[PDB]
């Protein structure tokens, strides 16, 4: 096993960037919709209903949508 190195940084701007560009890219692949259903539900579920961090809900949203993009791109797209 090889190990390193310098993968020190993020959360912060990493989270904001990740969410951002996954959204910019996901707007090219889905139609009514909208994506907000995921977003809203997340901000409704973990953030509101279990009163957890907004960063947490946005993280779980991020995860879900990375799995969505994975699914779609593995499914293939005509563009």
């Amino acid at each position: 096993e090889a190990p390193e190195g310098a993968g020190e940084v993020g959360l912060e701007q990493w989270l904001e960037t990740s969410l951002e560009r996954i959204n910019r890219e996901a707007r090219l692949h889905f139609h009514p919709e909208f994506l907000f259903r995921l977003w809203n539900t997340c901000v409704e579920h973990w953030h509101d209903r279990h009163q957890r961090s907004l960063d947490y809900a946005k993280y779980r949203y991020l995860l879900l949508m990375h799995k969505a993009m994975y699914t779609h791109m593995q499914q293939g797209c005509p563009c």
Binding site: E20, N23, R27, P32, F34, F36, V43
Partner: peptide, 29 residues
Amino acid sequence: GVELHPDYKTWGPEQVCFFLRRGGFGEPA
């Protein structure tokens, strides 16, 4: 910071929920 889709009239119910939560409303009831 979240951004997300604006204007205007062909807005699914959730683009309405989002816009509602923007004001301090929701209120899941």
